[PDB]
Amino acid sequence: GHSVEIIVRDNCGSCVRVKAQILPIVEAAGIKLTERNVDQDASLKLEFGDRVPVILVDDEEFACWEVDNDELANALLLE
Amino acid sequence: GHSVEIIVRDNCGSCVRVKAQILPIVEAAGIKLTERNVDQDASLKLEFGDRVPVILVDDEEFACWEVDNDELANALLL
């Protein structure tokens, strides 16, 4: 089994979208997703504030991020 | 004209994976992707060290990231 936690902040559309994207996968694993907010726990603002939202798997920051290749292509075809 | 840089650290599989994922896009644009390593440059570590890999387009921090659902599913479901 694994634990999964998302670290979010207030007024964070990216936080809400990432949560909605991962919920089916976490639920398929039989896991309860936990959520902590850097605007409530300053210890977390200090540790993670520069890169929220963060996903923790087994209480370790988990690298499950990819570049949007269409947004990257769009930037490169602009003058 | 454009530049693309990836900012990396040593022994980071996520840096290698992202570099491979973006390489065809940078090369479709006739651009040569460059690479700088925070473990070889202390200023660069101060700025980016805790959130590599970072992508710079025209020297600005590219913000359009998405969750890799299949990578998370792989880690949790197998």
Tokens of A17: 């979208």
Do A3 and A57 touch, CB atoms closer than 8 A? Answer: yes
Tokens of B8: 């990396």
Which residues does chain A have within 8 Å of residue B75's beta carbon, measured at their own beta carbons? 2, 57, 62, 64
Question: Are B31 and A71 an interchain contact pair (Cβ–Cβ within 8 Å)?
Answer: no
* Structural resolution in Å: 1.7
DSSP string across B42-61: HHHHHHHGGG-SEEEETTEE
Q: Which residues contact B70 (CB under 8 A, 6 or more apart)?
A: none
Rounded-to-integer distance, Cα B40 and Cα B18, Å: 20
Q: Which residue has the tokens 């570049």?
A: A67
DSSP string across chain A: ---EEEEE-SS-HHHHHHHHHHHHHHHHTT--EEEEETTT-HHHHHHHGGG-SEEEETTEE---EEE-HHHHHHHHH--
SS3 B6: strand
Residues A74/B21/B73/A61 CA torsion (nearest 10 deg): -90
Task: Spell out the domains of chain A, with CATH numbers in brackets.
Answer: 4-77 (3.40.30.10)
Pairing type for strands A54-57 and A33-37 reads unpaired
Cα nearest neighbour of A22 on chain B = B69
Question: For chain A, which residues lie within 8 Å of any Cβ of chain B, measuring from their own Cβ?
Answer: 2, 4, 18, 21-22, 25-26, 28-29, 31, 50-51, 55, 57, 62-69, 71-73, 75-77
Rounded-to-integer distance, Cα B14 and Cα B28, Å: 22
Residues B38/A15/B14/A46 CA torsion (nearest 10 deg): 30
